[PDB]
Ligand binder design. Structure first.
Ligand SMILES: CO[C@@H](C(=O)O)c1cccc(OCc2ccccc2Cl)c1OCc1ccccc1Cl
Length: 133
């Protein structure tokens, strides 16, 4: 029941500073422009200890499955090959991605009827807000 309030189908409804986040991560111009248009649907499910997060959009479809605290390989939507670990901290899903001596942290939390995603790379934060689909 660890992630019950996250489970479901969610649709992106707002974004702030995502272009700048992507710049900080090292994403190139064309990918930033196209990816920045996307309004993904995020599908979160749990089966035993395994959490699956799918993202479906016009730009790319991604899927990760993981156990909390157990590192895994991830290919991001911008084609980074990262090592990821996702944990729960006080009801917030905390996702750290490491690649090329770089790191980014993505936090997902339930706030009212929304799922709020905060993405941080160095001093740059982006906020992505999802509603139930
Ligand atoms: C599933 O993770 C979602 C979420 O929780 O909002 C999420 C959290 C943090 C960064 C994300 O994309 C980083 C990216 C995406 C595209 C280009 C450059 C970068 Cl740097 C992201 O996926 C967003 C995406 C996922 C799949 C398909 C399209 C999109 Cl636009």
């Amino acid at each position: 029941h660890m992630c019950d309030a996250f489970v479901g189908t969610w649709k992106l409804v707002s974004s702030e500073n995502f272009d700048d986040y992507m710049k900080e991560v090292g994403v190139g111009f064309a990918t930033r422009k196209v990816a920045g248009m996307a309004k993904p649907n995020m599908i979160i499910s749990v089966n035993g200890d395994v959490i699956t997060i799918k993202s479906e959009s016009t730009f790319k479809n991604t899927e990760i499955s993981f156990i909390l605290g157990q590192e895994f390989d991830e290919v991001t939507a911008d084609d980074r090959k990262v090592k990821s670990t996702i944990t729960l901290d006080g009801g917030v899903l905390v996702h750290v991605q490491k690649w090329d001596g770089k790191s980014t942290t993505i936090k997902r939390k339930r706030e009212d009827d929304k799922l709020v995603v905060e993405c941080v790379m160095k001093g740059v934060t982006s906020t992505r807000v999802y509603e139930r689909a």
